[PDB]
Structure formats: structure tokens, C-alpha cells
Symmetry: D2
């Protein structure tokens, strides 16, 4: 082939520094979306396995070395882990690509690079986490201590396996927490590989526990656990409801939700059309639309709409959908599995039926679970395709007249994850940025953030931040301490 | 009477700057725990009234002046409100005290003073709320904007009505949010009075909406509302479950929970026994134990235990339970209502039945009547597994226990589902540091209790909740953090 | 017409009292509209500075002010802001008569910013924070942000009330005691403000005002062995003497707010009518007696000719006259005879070096120290008028071709206080803002800041920030506190 | 025994190369154990400083370093930290022979703190933040935290590696170019560190090392017209000259880390054996050649007699000798002949003024600059030995009655660098900590800080912080940016 197919080494659960089978001895299969065939038979975690992993994390936090280590010591190990992710980038990229149906070179440069980058950023945060010394109403000394919380429960999706693992694990490790990670059943391989690398880096046993299994089994047990201090969840808005219920029905642990989106990209009259078209293609079709922040709604101002529409249709004619391991041309790979592939085509079918015009794509291909990049035109705001998260290579292209109209239409969603603005006008950019109810707003770009940039939703896209110093908050216990002072010359 | 009984002026719902009746025309009574008699007939808000209030708050945020005003402008209006609370402190104190069964002088100095203080602290925060300018991975400029969130839903308890109103309203107002406040049905008068004073201060119509009603009606409607951006809740751990469910079943709005507690107070052998006893009395019995952070569990080291126990029983002999409006000597007033009175009496009876020793109180009292008066109760020979040791009584009940080691004191302090507050009484700096850092509580007082100020963040750990009330930390729940990224062309530095 | 105020405060303000100088000496303050004596002010020297420093030392070491809670200090500070607002008209008329200003402009701008600075720091007082640090082992570390002690303040004549408030407000909030040396040309506002502070409840000894001459009273304060810091605002040349005075005494930290030669850059992009109106205000506000005045105006070649013609036409309706008797008055007299002659000397020098006189360039007096607003065209960068701070109503109007040229020319100064950019282009705005070595950069506006905005120079314009939470730093002592921990379950 | 290192780097380090001085002049560095020449080091003067400043100017204005991302600068700094760790033994041996230190103490303390400071700031590089401000109307305001430019560094001979790192690390992270003037007595470590920084990937011109004499090389750097700031560490008397050099040149901000006369307070409740052992280390670490050394020890009257006796018996087992040949060696020789004679002069002066000699007070040498650790009893506060910085193994042991007396006596100094408190009482500890006017206060310990802990003087011990996120401020330009907003839905 073009890229070397990796050898599957880690298929068991990772509890207390060891690779172990499920209590039941049950396995679940992970498949290659390029072929639809079984890659590996992975240990199937259930309630009993989650209990064992939570017990291992509890012992690691309450009695283990990790919270008792200096921030410098924790950051030292976290950096060695970042070094290992970088050293084994190629292997990890192919392993994630084969499991998630993506391009190994894109996975290495984007996914693995961001994973290593997130680990490095928090390794540098570990020795500089600060609390405050407060201003008191009298002869008192007050301060806050920013303590490790305890046992962190992590539930993540299948679209960015390595990045999802790092973005949750990294701020939790720097905070001094012990972890229980439940990766998505569709792509469980990267999380098990990363667990082995953390062991090699010097992360103490019990600090990182990986429990691959099904959501209503393993995931629900973790979200409902009486000895888990917090839960950081990334997935659908509908499953987010169940995570909130699981906490309410258990120990009322704080819940942090990174949910779906229906991200709008607004293109103005003054934009360079060639850059705006190229930006829109990337924004909508990166990772075959299996991106939470994907620009599923593209808004183009009436004066340049016809030109944009023509240039977009022309650009899509040179776009290649195929096997990233055998085809060099390949711009897009297959969808994660059978269930997702049926779901996108059903939405394409819904789009056709409700009266939307098909500009490009709208049908399956195969040189596997391949769908061509779809662009819907003459889209009404009330349409299913306009409102619902498709999570596939589907773009809704719309026309607008005013700045006011662009703002109101961008905000006409239950969601509020990301948004984009393409304009040269400083006053238009400022107005649009400040008026769109989204957690992240890109101006004349898309996706670009870095680990210093906090990422989180607004409205039904969730709450809580991943990345930035902001990410640490969910993993820390803020403790206020008050004592009287005797004859202090100042207060 | 020693304190003037106030004139009840505000009994209707406060929606879009006006005092209006409920859509149903229904009322609910608020009673005086000193007599058991009706003070006023308050408008009963339901689903329809909460919608009206949320629509008023939505119009005020989306199209009104409040989020469009500068932090300085919001700050001046907030300081005028703080000035009004101070100017009308006596009337508000009398009103809250008659509704809650409090001492008017204590309420003025503590409750009203903290309410005015929280409004002032956030008035000063309004013109200095900052976001960041970020460090980017290349030729990019990144920044965060700390925007007003939108419509803030507030659900609060009956124990500190004025303080609860201010502690939620003040950071929200400073953040530039519009509010919908659901006060507890037992004490709804203060929230209504405060709403009128905000109108006088210059708070625009629709920014503060007060909807008194029942929890499963008006409270559930607010927590389940599809157009409410966040919910800040203060109340029991059991109702907290329903707030989280209401969000999950609606628009998944962020929820912030300020829940119950079973706060431990640890006294070591090196303590001054007279100060430690006097501190324990205040920590346990302030506001007749109707305090979330009340030291319901007192742990005294074995060498000084017998002396502490004797000094505590002696101190309680001079404690006065009675009418704060007619008796000057009164240290403690009646419990909020009949329901709370029976609930505390049931826990005392349960305590006796499980084998705990009654050191003092444990029975009803006090003046010629009439009134929900309970003697401050101290339980001795309490086992950790006992109901009285684990459950929140929310009455004048203290569980007195003995301990040997620092390690034992820590483990026993942590033997709770809760983690709101805790106290340490010691002269030893190393013991104080170890106990402070080992007790899983949101607030730890060393050689004092309650003292915080508005710069001090307050929030639970474990089943006592999450999220901070007070401090600059309080603003977070009312703000939307927006990350903004743009490329840079030929910047000489990054 | 505006009512001429009655002068009531002419003595030194030491330990809560209005006292005469030890010598019994006075110095005259004059009205630039007539050149006549307004009042005879007590002349402070070394002995009076000693008395004021001793009063501040007693107030800090033994007095109430540092022992009060931030909340208590905040209420007193806010009462002072309320008083400045209540007496705004009287203070504006007083400052206007003394400095040759328009009483309505002084009320809206100068007095409003003074009241605003006091309010901002009143709200800062109860929320000043230190940190709880991340330690290398079983240790607990924290920083305390303590009041420093005795703050020495030396300020100029151009913005008397604003200068007083901008130094006094963060010092007051920090819990410091003060010794203020106002400029001899305008000493009246400071003495009025001192009385207002006493009425607000500021304890005796906390605010001491010692008007006098720079080499006498000013040098004594800068050289004092018991002064903990010096905040200086004035010329770059006097700044040298403040640094020497500290070096020759107790090596107290020095904070310098020096001169400027601020550039305003206008692109082809700009609305010419708004750009001309902005330039007029930026160059001629307070008769060019502004440190941040746009003394250099750069206009891109394509719109230069139109800008130049519109500017000359705009200046034809500009009124220079008595602000107390003429309603149309846009500009008052220059502060005094010395400043008046210094500006005329620079105008004459400009003519002699070959620069074209577009408008003004000669005295008016409708007798008074009135100078016509001056615009110089065909200005070479090497010219005296192009490089030196004139501090009068003089604008140097220049032409440019490229963004690169505009940046290089803006930076061709020893100074770096302020700068301005007029453009609709977001990328041009970002590039110029980030490339111009100035403390403040205004985009499509000028002067606008507010008390949350830190103000300070770069290069020879100084160092240190006035305004913002940043202004508190110079008045605080950061104390690091370290103790071991015994068996802490986390670090 | 320990291995004597090879001397490899003896030339100036300018623009990535080891070059000779323009004059071709050299100065000798000597071994304090023998008094013999170790190496002949290139002697920098005005011309060499000019060359180094020009190299730093080109590196900042046109080079890669300020244009690289914080992440990029952080990886290079972490590679440098890794190299300092890899070559720790060689560097410790190099610094030890040059400064008269124990190679094992230099490795664990000096080299460990140097590597630790580089690592802390490598982790700071990708997370330096400015603010987005609260505006007085329809305006958007923000601050940018820019690299300042050319940083001038002047450091002492006592902690060569630590001094180099503590100045270079925040400056590097900030994106500055540097010119380092190390002390003439110990120039070797700085040249070795410069070579390691080249190996790590620090671009040419970013780190320039100019060993030379103070009034020549040092004065030229402090007076340079193209240097943006100066961070100085040394004596209080030389600090005066650094302030004068900036005042007489370009008025660049100056940051001073000066001398001290640090008090250690021991109360009646202390464990005498721990308090004696702590005092021994606090006074005699690095043969009293420590700025923060506890040169004044105050013991409460009830435990004074026991403390005094235990201290004299503890000193009987203390070994002064060659650390390279004697394993028992607790103390090495004084840096040079000049320092040796200066300490002996102070000991002789102490005897002359009436102070009692408890231990030491005479030379030892098993020849080569060895002085016995000296303890003076019956010391009056007015004595020379009580007030002046000896900078040798000399301790003044005094008795006190009250907490109030301990505070007033601790504060009876022109200095305010460090202080220590030994007590079990939480209220006494808090009162002493908050009442002693010192930048650092250790409670029941000494020296312990870590790189998160800011270090700086108060009073005549200076101003400005080394270490912590606080250390970055001096190397950054804070730029305020203001623009109007059109129809923003919120402000
Ligand atoms: N924010 C700022 O940066 C800012 C603001 C306003 C004005 N300014 C600057 O102020 C200058 C105009 O004011 P000025 O003419 O009053 O300046 P100046 O330098 O002559 O004097 C300023 C102050 O210093 C005193 N002074 C003079 N000689 C002294 C000495 N030897 N020792 C100690 N103090 C001494 C004066 O009495 C006065 O109080 C201009 O250069 C202008 O740019 C700067
Ligand atoms: Na798969
Ligand atoms: Na009631
Ligand atoms: Na005058
Ligand atoms: Na040497």
C-alpha cells in the first residue's frame, strides 16, 4: 500500500497499569470502514469493569503518588508522554486512520500533532496553577487553594479518538486527578495505545484507566458512579441529556458537556471568492463532515452568491473520495461505520424530498462506506437539513442581503459551538463576531486555535471549556480558607 | 414591641417593572412563625407567569438597554441599589425578620449588610470584567470575549432571603444579564421589596423579574424553561436532582448548585476552651440552625473533651429562646414555619431513639403562646452511623463527639456525602495546614466561623454542590466566553 | 459665558490642614487669557516636603488608612468621586481659569475622567489579589499584595485634575499615604481636590499637597530618603533628574510618563470628512498641550491632496479666543508666557527649515497667549518640527505610499506614547497596530480609553502604567511567603 | 573526590560565535582554593558591547525568535533545560572551581534551579496573556503583551548558572534578544550556557555573552542607547550607577536585585535542634556569599542560652576545606583575595566594636582563602557588623523579649530582601510575616521557593521580580488597542 497498515497490539481493558479482559470475558468488534471487516476483537467493559477502574483511580488519588507529586514532577511525566506520542506519531496515525476511516498523513499532521500539543501545553501548566490571596472585610487573612478534585470520568466520541483522549486527559493529569476513560465503541484502539504510552512515560498505575465498551453499559455505569467526582462528556446533544440525568440520579457530580453543532460560515461582498470557496470546502468537508465544528451552513451575500456557487461546483469536480491507504489523490475517506453511512444518506434523502436543489454529490461511491461531498442549494431555514446535525459531507449553501439578516440566520439554531466570518471590513467583522451566539468565531480562517484557545459550546452545544488554562477548572477543587489576624499593620 | 412591625406593601409578582397578579388570580399565604398567623397573601406564580417573566427578561436582554450599557453605567445603578438597601435597612430587616423568624438587629447587621455589601462588590466589578488576548500557534491573533450570557434563572431558599437575592442578582446584574428570580414560598416578601428598590435605583424594566410561588410549579417551570440560558440554584440536595433533570429534559442549560451540608468543627487540645465553646455555640445555633454551613458536628480532642462538654452545658443555661420583637434578651427566634418545626422535633426524637445522650434542650419552648420555638439541642455519645450524625436537620441541633488523632479528625470530618463548610480550632500552624488541606469542603474556617466577605468564593464539594457564589468567581456562570481567531499578515512578533 | 470662580485654597495641604510654607514664601499663578495674577500660592521647599513626608509616614505606619478594609477605603474613595461630581462646575471653572481651558470641555473631559478614575479604583479596593503558588515539594507558598508605604507624586500643568486623580486613585486603593507635588503653573485644582478628600473622610496625612517649583519642592520629594516610590509625569529631560534623585538617595522605584511625538496614519480606505475631523481633534485638543497629541499626521498619497484641502477649509471655521466670554471658542490661550514663546519659536524654526505653512503659524489674541492652530506641509523627517515635542497647536502633515513606509516613519522617533490608524481594512489595522512601538494605538478614533485601559509609554516616552488594574502595581509590595507542609494529601 | 573540568569556552559569545575582544585583551579567572589562574577570558569593553547590542537588535528586528510561536520558543527552551540537565556534572564542576563551591551542592541546588527556571518559562511561553477590557461605551479595547526588544542583563559572581538562567529564561519566553554581562570573578558558567543554548536551537544574536569588568563592559551595556531594558543583580551601591546610566542615556526601565541584611526570628516554642540546624544553613550556605543569607539571628530570651550553646557545639563538627579533595567539606573558600580580605576586615571590626566571638573569627586554609564560620554574640544594633552586608560566613546572634521588639529590630535595616520566622504559633507567624518589610519571608524553613515563587527586594534591596510569571513583566511591552464598535448588542 501507500501507508503501512499497523499491527493491532492493544485490545484489552486498561485497569491499574495492566491490560486485562472484561469480568464477563466478552468482546466487541471494531471494523475498518474502507472494507467493513473486523480489525480487532476488543474487551467489552460493563458495570463491574467500570467499578474496578473507579476503585483503581480512587486508590491512585487517595493513597497514590500522583496528587502528592509536585506540579514540576507531573509536568515532567506529561512531557515524556508528549515526546512518546511524537516518536510513535506514524503508528498512532495509521491505527487511528484504519479505525476511523481517515487519511494517515492528515491524522499525523492534525490529530496526532494536536494530541502531542495539548499534552505539552498542560505539562507547562502543571507547575504554575494558582489560587488567590483575598481582600478581607476586616482583621482576617483569606485565600483559595486550587486542589486536584479526585476521580475524573471521561466519555468521548469516535471522530477524533487521539485528540479526544489528550484534550480530556492532559488538563486532568496537570490538575493531579486520577482518570477513568470510556472511549467510543466505533474507534477504541487509539485510547488503548495512548494508555500504554502513558505507562512508559511514568504515569503511576491507577491514574489512567481505559474502559472500551458500549454507551448504555460502560458509559452509563461511569456517568452514574457514586465514587466519580466529575464527568467530562463529548458527544451528541441527546446523550448529553442522559449524562445530566445519570449525575442527578447518583452523586450530583459536576457535568461538562461538549455537544453537537450546526455551524454557520458567513461570506461578505468584499471577500476574495477563491479563498472563500477554498475555506468553505475545508470547513464543511474536513474529516468527511465528521467534525462537531464543521461549517454545515454557508451564507453568501447576494452580490457574489452566483459566482461563489459556480466556483464551488467547479472546485468539487476535482475532489477525490476513496481509500487513503491506496489512493494518493484521496481528499475524503469512508464514514466511520454502517450506521453512520445510512444516517447521512437518510439526511441527503430528507433534503431532496423537502425541495432543496442538489448542486453536487448526493449519492454513494466506492473505488466501502463512501459518500460524495453534497452541496444543497435553494435551502429554506425551516428544512431538516438546515436545522439538524447531519455529521457527514453535507453543506447547505444560502444567499443573504444584510449584515442584520446574516446575524439573525446564523443564530437561528438550537446550537452555538462554532461560526465563521469572511470579510475585509473591520467594523462588519467586529459586529458579526460579537452578535453570533457561538463559543468560537473565526474571522478569515477556520479550525485554527492552538492549546491556549478555550473550546466549548453555547446554547444546546453545551458548556465547559476544553483547551486553554480554562480547561483545568473542571478538574480542580477551589477551597476558600479564612483565619483572623492579630494586629496586622495592613489589611 | 421593641422593634416596629413593618407595613406590607409588596405582595404581587414583579414582571417587566410592574407589580401584577398571577394569571390565575391565585394567592398563597406567608406566615409569622412567632404566632403562626398570616402576614400577607402573596400572588401565586405558575408556568404561565414564569413564561411572562422569561419573555420580559428576553426582551430586556435582546433589545433593551442593560447589556448595551457600559460596565460603569451598570455599576452606578448597582451602587444606587446598594445605597437604597442601606437607606431602607431597618424596614427590610423588620420585613425579613417577621417573614423568617429572625432578630431584627441581627438581620440588619448581618443579612442586610451582606446584601448591600454583595451589591457594592459587583458594582465595582462591572467596569473591570476582562477576557484574554491569547498566545497563538502561528501568524494568528486570538482573544476571548466575556459576554453577558442572557436570561439567568434564579431559584433560592427561605433561610437568608435578602442575602440569597443579592448573592445571585449582584454578579448577574454586573455581567449584564436579565433575571427571573423564584424566591422560596415560606419567605417571599424581601425579594418583592428588593425588586421595587431596583426599579427606584434605575434598573431597566424586564432586567429583574420576581416570581414567588411553589417549587414544583413556579420553580420547575423556570428550571425547565426553553428560553432560560442558565440556572443558579440554592436549596436541598434532593431538589438539586430535579434542577439537573429539568435542564436535561429541556434546553440543557448550565446548572449551578448550592446544596445542603453537615459541617464539622474540629477543636484540638491546644485551643482556648472558652473561645472554642463560644465559637461552637455561634457556629451551630446562629439563625436557629437554619444555616447551610452550620457546624452540626463538633469534634473535640479527648484531653479537653470533658471540660468542653461541661462548659458548653453551662453556657447553654444562659441562652434565651423567644420573641425577638418583644424580648431584648432573645438569642434565638422561632423556626420558619410549622413544617420545619415538626421536622426538627422528629430528628430530636429519632436521636433519642437511636441511643444518643441529650446534653441540653431537645424539647419545645418558650413565650406565652403559640410560636415555633425549639430549645438548642446538644447530643452526646453520638455514633457516626446515627441518622442525627449523617442527615441535615436544619434546626438548633449539635452532635458533640470525641476524637484522639489528627488523622481520625480528618477521616470523620470527611465521612459525609456533603462538603460545604468546615472549621478548625488550633494554635498549631502545621495542624491547621494539614486539616485545612485534608478536609474535602468548599470553605474551611480556622479559629473563626462564617466570616468571608464578598471577595471570598462560596460553593460546595461532593453532594454540597458545584459553582461559586461571591468573589470574582461568581461572574463565570453569567458570562459567555467567546474565542475569536483571525490570521495576521507579516506581524513582526507573535 | 461661564462664572469666574473664587479662589479659596492657596496654602499647602499637610496633615489635613492648610498651612503656609516654613519660609512664608508665595509664588504667583496667572490667567493665560490676560497674563494677570489669579492667586499667590504658598511656595513649598525641602523643609515643607520633609513635613509632608513625615505626615504621610505617620499616616501609613500608625494611622487608620492601611488598617482599613478595602471596602472601607472603597466607600471613602467613592464619596470623593461623588464630591468631584457634585462640585464639577466649580472645579472645571477653577482648572479652566488656571490652565487656559474651555470650562464645558474641562467639565465633560478632565473632571469626568478624574471622577471616573476615583470610581474605578474605589471598586478595585475590595478585590486586590495575590496568589497561592505551586510548590516544588511539601511546601505552601503564597504572595501578599501589601500597601507599599509613602508614594511620591510629581505631575505636569496640562491636565491638573486628571493628573491628580490618575496617581492618587490607585495609590489610595492600594492603601498608601501620598505626597503630591503639582506643577507651579496650575497648582489650584490639587488644593481644591485635597479639601474634597478631607470632606470625603480621607484620614489626615494620607493626602499631602505641596505646590512649589520643580528644582526645589519636586527635587526634594524625588530625593527623599523616606519616600517608598515616585510616580512622575512630565518631560523626558526632567525624567532623567527623577531617576538620578532616586539613585543618589534610597533607590526607590521610579515610574515615568514622559513626552511624545504621536503619529496618526490615514489610508486611502478612510472617510476623508471623518479623518479630517479626527485629525483636528487629535492635534488641536487642549491647544496641543496634550502628551498624546497627534503632532505627526500621515495621509496615503491617493487621498493626500483632498485631505490637505479639506483640513485647510475646516480650519477656517475654527475659533481661537476667550472660552469665558466667546461661545464659539474651540481653542483657548497657551498656559503661560514661557510656553507661548516656546511654541512661536518652533513655528519660526519650521519656516526656517523649509516647511510649508498650510494654515496659522502666527499669534492672534482677540491681550492673552493665543496662537493660531498651525499646519505644516512639505515636512521632511529630519526637520526639528518633525522630531521634537512642540506641545502647542502645531500639526506636521505628511504624505506616504506604502503600509511598510507608514510603519517605519511612525517608528522613526525616540518616543512611543500614542499612535492612531484610520482604515476600514482589518488586516492593515492589525499589521500597523502590532508594528508601531507605542503604548496606546487608537483605530478609527483617538483619546478614548476609560479607567480600565492602561496608559504608559514605550522607548523614551517612559515606563509604568496609569489607569487599569495595572496602575496598582507601583503602589503595592508583593511579599512571597513559604512554609513546609506535613503530610499534605495533595501538592 | 570530584573531577576538575576542562576549560573550553573562554572567548566572548556574539551573534552565535565565540570571538575575541576588539582590543585582543584578556582578564584572568582564578581558583579560590589555590589562588591560581584557571583561564584567560576575553575582556569585553564598549566596542564589544556595541557589537553584541547590534547582533541582538538584528535578531529582534529581523530575526526568527520574536516571529516564532510561544510553542516553538518553548520547545527550544525545554531542549536547553534538557542540555543543562545532561551536562549538570560538568557545569557544576565548572561553576564550583570558578566560585569555590562544592560540586555536589552546585549540581543539586545551582544547576537544578537553573534547569528548573528554563523549564518553568518554557511552559510559560505558549500561555502569555493580555486582556480584553471593559470599555466606557461602544468601543472594543484590548492589551497585547509584546516582546520588548533588547534586554540588558548584569549579574553577580555568587550564583553564576542560577543568575544566567533566572534572567535569560523569562526574557527568552517573552521573545526578547539578550546581552548578558557576567561578573568578572566567575565568567565561565555563562559562556558554557551560551554554547548549550546554540546546541538547543536558540537563533544567533538572541543570546550574547560579554564577560568584562563592571565600569567598562557593564557600564557600556547600562548606558547603551539601543538597549530597551536593564535587569541588574548586584550591590546596592552599583545599583545607583545602573539607574544613573539609564538616566544619562535612553531612560530604559531598570530592575534592581540588590543586597540584604536578612533577619531570622526564633521564638520560645521552636524545636531548638531544628532552629539551630536551620540557622547554620541560613547563615553559612555558600560561605555566606548569598544575598538572602540570615546574617542576623534573633532568639527569644527563654531559649536563647540553650540555642547559643547548641549552635557553638554544632559548629565544632563543621568542616571548612577543599570540596574537590575533602568529602566532609561543608564550606569552601571565599570567591577571591579581595572578598577574603573584606570579610576578615569586618570580623576584625566586630572585635574592635565590643562584640563577643562565640566561634570562628580567624582564617584556616589546610593555603587558599578559607575563613572559619563566625558567630558574634553581645551585638548592639548600632554596630557595623549588625548593619552592613559582610557577604561572608558571619552571623550576628541576638536576644529579644517581645514579638513587637523582634518586628522592629528585623525592620531596623535599609534592606528588605529576605527574612525568616521559626514558630509553631499560627497567629505569631501571620503577624511577623505581615509586619516584616521584606520581599520573601520563610516560616519554619529557609531558601525554598521554586520557579513559581517571585523573588525581589523591598526598600534598598531593590524592586522587580525574578522567577514566577511575575518575571515576564519586565521583558514585555503592554500595548493598549482601542477601536469604536458599530451596533454591538452588548458592551
Ligand atoms: N501621560 C503622560 O505621559 C503625560 C501626560 C501629560 C503631560 N506629559 C508631559 O509633560 C510635559 C509638560 O509638562 P511640564 O512642562 O510640567 O513638564 P516638566 O518636566 O517641566 O515638569 C513636570 C513636573 O516636574 C516638576 N519638576 C521640574 N523640574 C524638576 C526637577 N529638577 N526635579 C523634580 N521635579 C521637577 C515640575 O515642577 C512639574 O511638577 C510634556 O513633556 C508632556 O509630554 C506626559
Ligand atoms: Na472502526
Ligand atoms: Na414566613
Ligand atoms: Na496658571
Ligand atoms: Na574564579
Amino acid at each position: 500500500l501507500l501507508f503501512d497498515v499497523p499491527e493491532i497490539r492493544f485490545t484489552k481493558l486498561f485497569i491499574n497499569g495492566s491490560f486485562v479482559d472484561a469480568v464477563s470475558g466478552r468482546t466487541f468488534d471494531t471494523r475498518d470502514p474502507r472494507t467493513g471487516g473486523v480489525i480487532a476483537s476488543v474487551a467489552e467493559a460493563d458495570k463491574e469493569d467500570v467499578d474496578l477502574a473507579v476503585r483503581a483511580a480512587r486508590a491512585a488519588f487517595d493513597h497514590g503518588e500522583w496528587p502528592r507529586m509536585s506540579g514540576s514532577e507531573r509536568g515532567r511525566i506529561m512531557a515524556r508522554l508528549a515526546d512518546l506520542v511524537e516518536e510513535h506519531a506514524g503508528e498512532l496515525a495509521a491505527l487511528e486512520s484504519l479505525d476511523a476511516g481517515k487519511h494517515p498523513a492528515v491524522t499525523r499532521a492534525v490529530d496526532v500533532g494536536n494530541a502531542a500539543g495539548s499534552l505539552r501545553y498542560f505539562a507547562g501548566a502543571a507547575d504554575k496553577i494558582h489560587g488567590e490571596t483575598l481582600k478581607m472585610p476586616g482583621q482576617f487573612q483569606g485565600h483559595t487553594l486550587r486542589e486536584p478534585l479526585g476521580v475524573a470520568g471521561v466519555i468521548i466520541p469516535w471522530n477524533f479518538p487521539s485528540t479526544m483522549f489528550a484534550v480530556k486527559v492532559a488538563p486532568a493529569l496537570a490538575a493531579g486527578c486520577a482518570l477513568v476513560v470510556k472511549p467510543a465503541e466505533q474507534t477504541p484502539l487509539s485510547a488503548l495505545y495512548l494508555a500504554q504510552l502513558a505507562k512508559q512515560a511514568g504515569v503511576p498505575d491507577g491514574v489512567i484507566n481505559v474502559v472500551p465498551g458500549f454507551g448504555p453499559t460502560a458509559g452509563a455505569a461511569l456517568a452514574s458512579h457514586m465514587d466519580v467526582d466529575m464527568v467530562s462528556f463529548t458527544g451528541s446533544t441527546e446523550v448529553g441529556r442522559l449524562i445530566m440525568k445519570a449525575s442527578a440520579e447518583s452523586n450530583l457530580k459536576p457535568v461538562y458537556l461538549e455537544l453537537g453543532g450546526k455551524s454557520p460560515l458567513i461570506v461578505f461582498d468584499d471577500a476574495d471568492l477563491d479563498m472563500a470557496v477554498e475555506l468553505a470546502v475545508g470547513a464543511s468537508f474536513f474529516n468527511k463532515g465528521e467534525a462537531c465544528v464543521a461549517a454545515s451552513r454557508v451564507y453568501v451575500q447576494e452580490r457574489v452568491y452566483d459566482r461563489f456557487e459556480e466556483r464551488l461546483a467547479e472546485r468539487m469536480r476535482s475532489w477525490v473520495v476513496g481509500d487513503p491507504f491506496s489512493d494518493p489523490r484521496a481528499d475524503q475517506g469512508p464514514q466511520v461505520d454502517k450506521a453512520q453511512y445510512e444516517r447521512v444518506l437518510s439526511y441527503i434523502d430528507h433534503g431532496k424530498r423537502e425541495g432543496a436543489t442538489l448542486l453536487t454529490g448526493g449519492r454513494p461511491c466506492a473505488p466501502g462506506y463512501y459518500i460524495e461531498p453534497t452541496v444543497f442549494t435553494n435551502v429554506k431555514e425551516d428544512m431538516i437539513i438546515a436545522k439538524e446535525e447531519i455529521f457527514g459531507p453535507v453543506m447547505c449553501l444560502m444567499k443573504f442581503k444584510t449584515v442584520e439578516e446574516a446575524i439573525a440566520r446564523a443564530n437561528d439554531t438550537r446550537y452555538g459551538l462554532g461560526a465563521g466570518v469572511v470579510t475585509r471590513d473591520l467594523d462588519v467583522a467586529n459586529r458579526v463576531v460579537r452578535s453570533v451566539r457561538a463559543g468560537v468565531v473565526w474571522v478569515n480562517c477556520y479550525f485554527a486555535m492552538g492549546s491556549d484557545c478555550p473550546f466549548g459550546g453555547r446554547k444546546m452545544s453545551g458548556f465547559g471549556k476544553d483547551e486553554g488554562m480554562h480547561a483545568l477548572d473542571k478538574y480542580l477543587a477551589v477551597k476558600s480558607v479564612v483565619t483572623p489576624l492579630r494586629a496586622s499593620p495592613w489589611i
